[PDB]
Write a protein that binds this DNA or RNA. Structure first.
Length: 165
RNA sequence: CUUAAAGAGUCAACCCUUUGCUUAUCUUCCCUAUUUAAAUGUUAGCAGCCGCAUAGGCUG
């Protein structure tokens, strides 16, 4: 599948990962990831890396995405579209912490608050140490951290560039 | 075989009483604490809903 590169440059004044996350947000908000364009990162060791890599099967051109990232052009670099027979596809993994599932136990099982604390008191509290990005969510008005990890390649992708199922 | 060799010091108790260390003091003048600077380290791990799950997925 042919692919394109979006490398964050000159982001020292601002962290590199903040520019990476803003690149993800601007690629989300102006379309791009309809259902078939996916992201991958060549340098996840402990950081998310500074290269966004889009491996759309139909083909991503330079002009559409450089018009999309007109806001990041001061510290971005776009390579010409190259080809890759295999891309290392990542997916979204989310975390739950206490009250999250407590409200689920309010609205699914219909139990009271104290017994919902009782079934979950000694449980939960997982801690994801995977490399991540920090995403502005616009439909739900709060900003969060989204965790990415390696999984088998899927035909369909989300609106963010990660695998489905 | 070392002035070798050897050896029970025991007992008992009333230190008493008394008392004026008082008096007066000038510490005091003086004066530059000055000038900087990214808090970075992703700085957050969320809100619903798909579900029997506090298993596993999806949505932004």
């Amino acid at each position: 599948y042919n692919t394109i590169s979006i490398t964050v440059v000159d982001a020292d004044d601002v962290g590199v990962n903040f520019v990476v996350s803003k690149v993800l947000s601007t690629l989300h908000n102006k379309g791009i990831f309809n259902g078939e364009v996916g992201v991958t990162f060549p340098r996840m060791d402990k950081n998310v890396g500074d290269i966004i890599t889009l491996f759309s099967k139909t083909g991503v051109d330079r002009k559409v995405l450089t018009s999309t990232l007109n806001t990041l052009t001061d510290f971005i670099h776009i390579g010409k579209p190259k080809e890759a027979d295999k891309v290392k596809t990542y997916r979204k993994v989310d975390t739950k912490s206490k009250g999250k599932l407590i409200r689920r136990c309010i609205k699914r099982k219909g139990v009271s608050a104290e017994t919902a604390e009782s079934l979950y008191g000694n449980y939960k509290g997982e801690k994801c140490k995977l490399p991540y990005i920090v995403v502005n969510s616009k439909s739900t008005g709060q900003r969060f951290s989204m965790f990415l990890e390696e999984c088998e390649n899927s035909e369909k992708f989300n609106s963010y560039g990660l695998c489905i199922v």
